[model samples]
Target chain A: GLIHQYKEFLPVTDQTPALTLHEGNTPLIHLPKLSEQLGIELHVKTEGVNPTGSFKDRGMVMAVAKAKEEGNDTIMCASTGNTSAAAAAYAARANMKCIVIIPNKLAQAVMYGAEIIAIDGNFDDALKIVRSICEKSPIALVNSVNPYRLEGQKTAAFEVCEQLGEAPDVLAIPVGNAGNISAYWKGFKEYHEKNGTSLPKMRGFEAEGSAAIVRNEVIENPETIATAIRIGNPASWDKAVKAAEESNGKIDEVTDDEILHAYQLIAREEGVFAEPGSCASIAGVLKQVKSGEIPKGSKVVAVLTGNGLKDPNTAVDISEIKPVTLPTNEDSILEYVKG
Target chain B: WKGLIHQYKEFLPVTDQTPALTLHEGNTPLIHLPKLSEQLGIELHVKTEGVNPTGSFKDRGMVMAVAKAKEEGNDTIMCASTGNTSAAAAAYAARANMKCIVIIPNGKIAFGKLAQAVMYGAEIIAIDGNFDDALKIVRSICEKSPIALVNSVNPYRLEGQKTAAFEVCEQLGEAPDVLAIPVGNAGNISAYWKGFKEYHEKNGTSLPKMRGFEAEGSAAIVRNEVIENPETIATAIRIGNPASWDKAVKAAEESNGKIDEVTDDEILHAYQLIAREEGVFAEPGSCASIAGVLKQVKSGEIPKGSKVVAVLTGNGLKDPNTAVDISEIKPVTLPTNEDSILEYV
Candidate 1:
């Protein structure tokens, strides 16, 4: 739906099929509690509200539509998480078969009817097989590098500008494959050029263990509690760096403790539950605001990339919340309520 | 904050006293299912209510009930719920900064919904009885105390839920010939029929046939009696005696619709069918509507070429355990070689 919603801004034409699950129009929720604490006007672009419960749907909707327009019957990708679900869902909508390599809420991908082929090796091997298979066969590869992906993802930035009546002072996001940050920056620039809208400073967050851009090096074994951003090497590393430098922003890392803290804080205080990985953006905003990196009274928008229900295990394990067992008697229940 | 109450203010029982509260619950996508439509010989669109704030259609009702409770100066809300209701009530209570107590039958519940309720800081009270007993206790407690009940039995909840019907009519520019829905506590079907008839009077739109589907294990309406132990894999609809039974029957009869039952197997098949063919992953209980459509189509009860809208009440992500349990996801592993993978594809 992103394409149809912003067709003029996108590479949409008569040939491009109207593929939509009504993926966009996510809420730009104001974080009243967090804003008061941080001394800034804070809002969250809740991208988790998208059809597949993640921002990935923005890209996949476009990618799948173009694939259908080009007469492709099958699409291939090497993702075990959000990408798999997004790609598979759009492919199913397009009435095209999707082949996902490498294992992983495999339940989500399974529900979307993706053909799973696990590799005996690591993530690199899965990528290699996906690329080779796409090259040999007619199966269109819809990985992160797909041009339509960034084009579609940029629409989120447009929504932020429209919702706020202008761009926020800062745009904080979690950097996984680095494509999202780059796409957002591109969107801001294009919107500014086309509509004379103000541009925002781009602040991209990475998990401490997977801070490839911040460290200026690749981590062979990236380890983080936020599985979505557990990336050792970013695919759009160059574009992300350019966006940071050009926009007067920086790429930073957040500790697992900080990420977990921000995750529960948002849910408990604001009643907004988002994925652990998505909380990295909130964690970065908290750190920067405390250290005087982000000035007071600034309007900041944190992009929550995915829904929390995607990983209930993290919530249960991290929160350590359990039910208080009670008998069937109403008296005991009343007593507890009295307290 | 264009939430359900504010969006459909004219149609609702909202007053100036009603606080402006929202989690942006409504305005869910109405997705057209091309493959399923072609297969079933009808125009099929799904009103996906799962993408709501609390991952279920319960948010629509919960927002209204909580707002009304706040308007009446109630500081605490309580509900007897299995999963979706607890999550919705807790979230709305948190948003309004009020205390929420949830009473559930002691056992395994939807972990995601439980996690949501916990995250929203709901006081969890597990009873050693079934869902009916929990409901009875809540009713008794609310009757005696100042604590407000935020369940489907609450009239304000139905007032909030009727907005979904308004959306369906507006989205399609008119009402579909058939409005298919999964019946759990039966409140939703009754509320939807109310919404349609009201909208028809207000906007001169056509009313839809209110077809409701109950899980076979909990088909009390169809069986004309209640079961002591209603068992179903679709935990959301495992109620033996629905609270809105009379209202549901009246809605069906008034609209020339029928209440049908779908087996657990058929529900699972429909659940997988939507996900595989149309890429919509709804909860198993929500799939009862899809399964009912398939059954009715096969039996020639639903005529060909009729426009239908099936309401998906909850997100599939809310019940991850069931998906894994029912999925045939045995992956074939090879030596990570390109040639080996090529051969398989």
Candidate 2:
């Protein structure tokens, strides 16, 4: 099936390789334990299983394939999180150069073979330069702005529909660049129109510090513990709003505290450990459940966008890994265990 | 997803009450390295176990073990592990509404593969002794208590891990000529061999000769001696004495295969090669399978037309420290200008 399974709805060309790492068909894991705890029929779309360990692979595969079809030899993105990892991985698969530009602080996350360009200026400066260079050069920008990326991302919604037999009562997701929400909304609408599958209310959550779409204004300095969603201004702000409005759903913000708590709950209770940003969806779900916006017993699917392994720093920083030491002797160890 | 409990229920020891607890552990990608296969002149495919929810192959066994333990009304599970096993056990326990206690070597250091296990909220206890001591203590504890040990000693682990072989058969519509894997704790290779045999008996798929590679530093079975001070950069397989040693050797003997050893340098070399050349970033330990194939190919033992399946047991993210020290990825200052960017592009 590779990438060809979705070509019926996508703009796949003859030149496109139908390239894939078998990225899609991610597991729809039912959280019976968490569902009981949360008082909802909870499920998680585990996008961490994607080849590059993120939901970004769905979009990046199409973006890279399209770039190859269009005769681009290089793919470029500006990211220090899941997007950079996805872009670099797909670029490697498609036989193209992948260039990443990030701050010195995030230089460690550079992909195995992808070229990392460090800038002395702030992330804002690097991003500005990224747009300038990508627009002007022959290098294909695999950023959120790439329409092919969104086109590819919409397939995730298609998959959710296929897996669940239709959309659930709600689709909860984290918003960063905001393109994912719009893509998902488009997919739901398209699938509903084509297959008459029930369209779930698109519930999008952003970090409190970075809720530009909700505020309808750009934040000069977006600050959040969720580094993945630490964007002051999103690329698809207008489209995200439209999706929210059309679905009779709301774009909301959750605090860093809520995000971290949800993060721990998902790991400790549901056995699902995702990236911090991905937990914004779960945090939103929890808040909505408390607020009675999403009623009890309603089926919900939370999108876990990236792998927890991708952000070891965040997890380690907040871990209780401190161990209680015991003696080497069997008697001492047994006594300690008994106590 | 309805986990392996449902799919392979008949083959497994399960009852109606046994919950199909799943992190969707199985059904990993069997990706063919087209460029690599073309160069090597063999049909080379990699079963990417890394992409599992816990980012390692241990999830497959843990899912089964945890499910069975919960089914039997055990509310707690425990293991002595420094890495993947603990992560998998902790995750399943979290989902199963159970407790997971992990024994580590003075877990004060949050480094190594302890992050995932810790993140899953396992109660971590530090041991003054080494892994063998921890393993002995855990074995004794599980023997006396209601705690279910998720260490490789658990028979159900191999039952769950065996499904990987069934998947490869399903994907290829036949068994490959060779199944190459790293012998870490020896459980996985033994599981694959058993799975291939059962699948062959039922589905008529051909049986592949199992080729298991051990890290040279930890080549206990290959050297026919216990390594009291085993050391290797491939931390996953840095076992002095594997629990499934007899079974691993038996599988190789029955399949007319070889149990070989690859050096740490070779393992690391293959690790970087997969990432750089094939766009697959498997952990350093998992690269032993690749190293074994390359060595066999060089020695002219593995012919050009062989159908080879290399098992990548874990994700590279499990070992970020390795990437940092050896990625050869020094930051280059390419300015905002097109001229500077063009130099690399």
Candidate 3:
């Protein structure tokens, strides 16, 4: 659907198959209470509503389409979370085989359809092997490294621009493999070049354990409760840095505590449930705004990368719902009910 | 965003006075199941209602119920649910700025199922009784007071849910030869059948045979008797005495369709089959439609080459524990040795 909506900007042609799971067109939910509290016009781009329940669908759609157009029958990736699910769905749609190599440490519906190969290693090792495997084999890699993946992911920025009627003052996003932030920046810049729309500052957030950009070094063993971004080395590291510097934005890190707080805060206050990892963008916004780094009265769009349903375990664990036990009698029930 | 009410206002009970309350519930994708269609020799598609705002088809009705309640100036809504209904009711009630109360059975309730309702700020009350008692209490409370009951008993709920059938017709340019759905409280099947007939009258499209599937353990309509203690892995459809049993039977009899029952094993098989074959991971309960279709095809009841639309009622992520239960998280390990992995590949 994103391709049909933004075919001119996407790498599409007659040869490329019209592959879609109705990806994109996600909700741009405005946070009224949170925005008022922070004194900024805050909206969240809830990409979790995509078919595969993540922003990864935006890129995977294009990657699979291009692979199919190029006459490839199989697509491969080594993903920790979202990428494998997106690749598998698009591959199924395009009638191609999908092979996902994952680290046993992290897990998903990636088990649903993808041919999974797990190694007893970290995410970095898995990606390294996948990159080398694709280099020496006939399998097409559908990871974010694939140019078309970013090309497809850039469409999210396009949707945001179209949804809001212009670019916001700040584009806040969670940096996992860092492809999304880079993709959004590219999308904003390209749209600006074509329609003379103004560009926004690109703010990227990483879990404290996986804050590779902020630390200016690769983390050997990245650890975080936000497993999606628990990457020791982001593949699009250089591109992400360039985007941030060019857009006059900052790359920041949020503690697991802060991430969980935002994760629970949005769900309880606004009824919008998103993945814990996605709350990094919200956490970053909170931290920066409190410190006056993001000035008051600026328009902000925080990107929620995946659905909260993707990790029900974290949700059940984070905010324990202790229901009040009651008797079956009417009078006693009404006592609590009236109050 | 403009929700199903605005999108299908002419067919719905929409008035200028009614507030356009929405969480963008309807317009779910009708994903074509190429692999399953080929296997069964039937043109098959799945209405992935799991992609709705609260990750279930219940949102369609909940939106309408909450909106109507808000329209009637009700400040609070109540429902007796342990799963999808509670979440949908809570989310829509929150959107409408109404207080929501979810009454669930006492004992070891699944926290994962209640997570959505809790997150949506619903007041949870665990009764020291069974689900039936919870429903009975909720019914009594609503009747005696102003608090609105958002369960399927509310006419507006079905009024909202029927829009899905309208969407399927619009998506496919007409209704398919058969419209299959998982029958829980039986309201959805009746709602869908109503939707198809109403749309057919206005659009001049052919109607679909309304097929309803129930989990074997909870096949009340099929058995013509309630099993006091209904049980099934498909918790969404684990109802013994369906609320709309007569209407479901009527829809089937009128449309020349059959009400069927599917085993938990069959449900799990279809659940894994769709996920592994089509990359469409739906809730185990939602898989009953696919399971029923598989059974009917095997029995030669549903002949080959028939165009069918099976409704996937909820998202698999809503109950990820099922996927984990059916799958082995453990994969082939090589201790990070490049040579060991290269040889395996």
Candidate 4:
């Protein structure tokens, strides 16, 4: 018999501290169709409905509170794109000073995020400059470099493990700079250590051109269409490796093309539009399925990190962009429908 | 401005209505990505800005703009936008009981943006020229008409937008190593820089560097080291002459950041990656910053173990056309059979 020790974990009741309608527990939808297609049961933890429209909100709320508890009023971070926007918005909600450094050619959505956050700049340059400023200024860093960020991010793993009521047969995720993956592994390990549940096989997938972690080689020139995972060197490399080794899991690479296939499939078949980085896990899962790496009908859960709305251009490009020009008459509509 | 905040205190007052502004619209989530960390050898996090009120971060500035405009005893406001700004302006203006006029380029604006403007009862003017032309006309009209211009060209606009930077600091409880943004009219970047500097000066918090990104086709900031003629598929930012070009340049210089460009393909690629990987859907223009982040990660632009966040502005609903390409519509027969339901269900 399954144990119903719901009290052991945090409850998703109204008592949860959230930004009113922005936070709290997300949906755990079963991917029956995708599961059947893959010959495995699949369930997606849809964090996209978070206040900020992504799973990041789960950690941000806690991180912001922690910062407040620490008696800080400002924060800064380097973002490839999304984190800057989320942090800026959350910081604004807290009425704190927020700065975000990003790359020169980030997605247009990121630009708007900067506009909203009112903090924008080059990712690397911003990092260097902000570091110097933080040395003398009062603003705290909200970036992943801040240990508190990880503390908040690790909650994802906790939620997943708790949701399953136990560790699944396999836990898969996309590896970018490896902070999230490491955090997930840490969360799982901690839960297991705490006797919450057994840890699952931790598998990470990275973009082919950006497989710095999987290759275990110092990246000299790395590139990938999966912008989220196109890191040359990851900050949490050691942690990622440790997670894989300790969990008896493996880290693999997926080509951009292959990643796109999974990305398209998620959108078309699963109605789950994801960014390339998010698709890496699905791509890795598919690869495993084809290669018979994962046992058939095994309980597998793949982490869908972010939301697909962050990048519209890629979604449009990956799929066909056809403008169906129908006449303004009801007959035309009816005819099209009938055909 | 103070009086306006009081007048709309039920909705506009920072203490009352502002608090009621579904915190969901303005504040987004900040996330750390280990997958990106391992590749860049740097700590990276993404900020999903697309979750704002109007589906873009513009809501912050627009809300502030309306608040300030009301404070200044302005009952009518006008502005020019590619799309997101117009939507924000209209929504905020409506909330403030102020009449709004939105000038947009004819046929260039997205359908969703147009719908928002119409829904908000904004006086829409579809100019026959490009965004710059529309802006020029709007500016000229504002110079003569009693209507106040709510565009970023207005200093107050940036002041309100700067709140985003302020919020970031508050959320993180600290300053980060870097700040990244996409440069269009450059007002957003400038506002962020100013906010960061001010927050540090007043709060004794550390300041972060500013990084600005521009599309390769419309990279006047990076191309001229100043504002130049710009163009790009990111229609929202296809400005050949940005009103806040000077401010953008100054922010980059002061922050020790360089404005650069990414190819359209790169932009599209980043767009797709974010959608598939992050589950964040946004307009094409919104993906520019993510594209830039990808480029920087690949080029070793970000340092190892550095904290990172990428701003994602605007919602994908603003451009529903994008989804049509990414997804296919299945045809259902009229004779609803079990087989038909079987495939979908």
Candidate 5:
């Protein structure tokens, strides 16, 4: 039977188990304007409204549940940013101890996330330190390296397919450590194998400097303006390659300039605000449109990935400041509005 | 008043039907930048965090922090902040039934801070000297006293803030190519970077590069120097040294980006631009990130076609004085006949 496609995922019932973090059922809005403008139907799956704000909640909930299944009382992970935040929040939600190790020179935003959960220390140092602690402690590692995280994320692909009424013509996404793409492929493949919906073409985009997936070779030092994809070596490299091959999808490279352009376009044209790393799919779609890779007027959906509020500095920089002056009084306010 | 009331009612502010958490805090609109996008030839989206409960991005952090604190059996929490943090801390603390002690710089704290703290019934301690001094006292109290430190230095604070990053990814349903934010204490930027990366790792979403901006006066992130005296019109970020300095540096390195600075004039310009262009009024400190972004664009620091989000931290009402210098007010003559009042009305 098709997974019950309801307006909202059923809240944890007596028969079903409770989750530390409520994750599942994100919004899928159609971008008709963007679709018409780009000569391709564009649909954006907004995952920002999830608990804890990012898609990590989806996997975190699953991972935490799995940990509970295994009778774990604590969790640990080394993170660049979002994962640590998720681990901490979910752990806190579950009344479990969460230890997060982050990089020494992390962004203030990343630091904020870890602090919220009371995760300890810098990434490398924390990781090294936590490994020994986890060896002795009963804490489970909640990082992407954890298989449960991948399983949890695959549900998003399931949700996407359910939302579209059928499989999409193409599924475009940004490639970071390549775990998301791999998981998405797994979900889509499983869905097809289980229910026999024709699989859609899968496409993944990587920042030029962080084109590890496209190159099929790990760069000792990977760098990109898209910080999230700055992984020199992805943990799920093998899985990503296999998923791409199995899906008959192509992995492509997009320049930093192209990525930024797409970022601006989505905000200005589509009324969708997203962080740079999340906009890789949109950027890739724009590239495909220009290169004639995507057939004109094909049904397509570009995963926006992240919220714009997370990186206000990028949005402001990429945007022009237009100033309007309004007086304090009602009359002035009216005049200002009219003008 | 009419328009305000209409908008308030239209948005259904705090209505019975509205969810308790959906009190006009999150789900802020994402606006586009035509000129900037055209100049860079890419799509740009700016998520305004000003609409939050405490009128800054800090509200998000406070929500999670206070909720956890309440759950942990802690009745008293303390924090040291320049201004915005205190306001958010007070509101969330109040909501959680916890006594909040906010130690702020003696005479430097903003009026809005006092208003929010007072309204929320928080114990506002106006400590003599700078934020560092207040922070020092607060840290000592945390070490010696029963109150838990609710400042960004607290690990839970970051976890709370990371939700903003998570929210961003969830809202977009994908990761962005670049994520830019202002570097103040550097806590906010670091939390966001961590949030994005974690989401990607967990969900297979791509991660964006993290870009950060700081005021020229407090360019510690850019200079990698511990300045003894930092001065900027953006009072929220007018700090000599940030506690999360190392974390800020790591975020830059890990994200493959750099922290940069913007002049006061640029900050003010962006602040005014948000008001006039985007209908978003932000404080000078909040505008500092946008100013730094414009600087990057002008200097070609950022590549064209990058999807970027500028995290507007606080609302302009926090200061209410930034726009004073921009225009002069002229009084209008009193009432006319109904026929003549039509246009004026």
Candidate 6:
């Protein structure tokens, strides 16, 4: 039912097989408490709830299907992040060969049933090898550069518009490779034409360390605690910057501290635990709204790009998942809480 | 969004003005385990609760508790939890714009690794105590007072968790012949039974025999007695004294279901198999249900062609540490050369 619902807006044909993990139609939950506190109607589009636990699945489904429809037997991705998992999972679901190239061994890729080809050298070597192999082969590159990926991702914008019955006042999205923000802007514009959904300003946040667009230069060694958005050079950098500017918005950077604080706030305050990287939007929303960049009472939707469980190591330490070792005595327990 | 409570308000406790709070818990995928079913000779479907908002089944119950607590005018919600409970409580508290306080003993939990908890921004208290200090301490903190205890004992927990069974029945078009669950606190099994019965009464879906499994080390309900120190690699089911023991026992007995036990080895075997064979990576504790089904199928207890739905309680990514511990789980790190690279998967 993935493409079936969005067939009109999406590039789906009669020949397109029914490929889906029910990826889209994620809930757009209104934050009553947060909204009340901030004096705005706030909502969250939980992309983490998607299949494979990320917004990537929406793109991967479309990419993988298009590849198979074009008679490609294998889908190859050169990465060690959620993209590898997303491409590999869709390949497996579609019964196609999945080749993952990683610089080192990553357990996440293997768990998703992808064939991992660990590079003896760093990730750059794996990328070179992947590119070298794809030059002559029909290995469909389901990477960020793939246009279909953006096509599928734009569905989130469609869903957001439909869920809210129109475009929100602003779309706060986290920018990594910057593809999502551009795709979302495209989605919002297209859906607005057909459904008459009002256009929302597109605001995107990049990790301060990986703020290539904000800096207008490359970061040789971009590093951040939010691993997902720790990009040195964004593939769709211009598109993201233009989308932000064209939407009458801005693309900015949020520090790791800000991201983590927002991440923790959403979970502790809202009962939502998203990927550490995805929380950048939450932090952006807080920062922008607090600074009056976003007027209070404005309708806002923060895009949570992935599930928090995708990063369990970052969830809690083996030491912390444990409670205080108070004696089994009820009195001792009472005293501890009282203390 | 019409939260699970609002969606199922007819079957839930809610007033006209009750606020609908949600991370969109429930409506998880009911993935059919075709390969596992073929291999095991049983018609199998998996009620994958791992896909819940927080990557665990706790969100289902936690969402309900937070919404109810907010509607009831509670100012703060507290839980003595270091695991998923803390995460859920903190998130719900944030959602309700209420206060949440999580208490742990001194020298407990990796403060750095509790990044998610830190992100949720819960008030964390470190006590000079151990894990056992939780329930009593939290209860005493409540003492029929303002600080509401949000642990398993909260009635809203089971009330919320019961919706999972409703989703299972609705997704499957009817209840399967058997409903297999991993029993930790025994609350989930009881909640599912309650939901199925409610569905049957309201919609006439056939009731499935409730089958519950506990890790052998923590089979308190199966043994009908609590153990002093339960041990299991599956930390989620390491409960020696289940709070919902009576209700769980009743669910099993009334539905002709059995509360069984599976060893850690069997649990691990089933856990790995589900990943490799079915491409479904559920938490180890959740695999107790799968292990039970496998054991039953082997013993001719679950006859061939018996329709069964094993509930996967949590996502596998939540326990990647366990995968790191075993040597076999590691990928073969090879040279960048094409020959050695294509040799390993």
Segments in model 4 whose C-alpha atoms lie over 4 Å from true places:
A1-339, B1-25, B225-230, B326-345
Please name the candidate that would achieve the greatest lDDT relative to the true structure. Answer: 1
Please write out the lDDT profile of model 2 over residues B1-345, one tens digit for every residue: 466777888888888888868877888889998877888889999999998888888988998999888988898999887588888998999888899888875532224357787789888777765565577788988898888988989998999999999989998778999999998689999999999999889879988989999999989989999887677888788777788999999999998888999999999889877776667888888999999999887786678889999999998878877777676666787666666766665
Q: After superposition, how far is residue A157 of candidate 6 from its true place, in Å?
A: 1.0
lDDT of 2 by residue, A106-154 (tens): 3223444678888767787887778888777767988788899899889
Worst 10 residues of 6 chain B by lDDT: B105-114
Grade the docking of candidate 6.
Answer: acceptable
User: fnat, candidate 4?
Assistant: 0.01
Error of 4 at A40 (Å): 51
Docking class for candidate 2? medium
User: Whole-model Cα lDDT per candidate?
Assistant: 0.90, 0.84, 0.85, 0.64, 0.65, 0.79
B-chain TM-score, every candidate?
0.98, 0.95, 0.96, 0.85, 0.86, 0.91
Among the numbered candidates, top DockQ falls to 1
Candidate 5: residue A103 Cα off by (Å): 3.7
Which one wins on TM-score? 1
TM-score of each: 0.98, 0.96, 0.93, 0.50, 0.49, 0.90
lDDT of residue A1 for candidate 2: 43
Model 3, CA-based lDDT: 0.85
- What CAPRI grade goes to candidate 5? incorrect
Off by over 4 Å in 6: A37-39, A68-73, A135-139, A290-292, A312-329, B17-19, B69-73, B76-82, B101-118, B121-146, B327-345
How far in Å is the alpha carbon of B342 misplaced in model 4?
15
Off by over 4 Å in 5: A1-17, A105-129, A322-339, B1-345
DockQ, ranked from best to worst: 1, 2, 3, 6, 4, 5
What is the TM-score (0 to 1) of candidate 3? 0.93
lDDT of 2: 0.84
Give the C-alpha interface root-mean-square deviation per candidate. 1.6, 2.5, 2.6, 20.0, 26.1, 4.5
Cα lDDT tens digits, model 6, B1-345, are 466886788888878777767777788888787768888988998888877766678888888888788888898898765356666777777777788777654543332224445556677666654434554577776885587778778888888899988888888888889999999778889999999999999999988999999999889877878766666888777767777899999999899989999999999888877765555677788899999999999988788999899999877766766655542444567776654544453
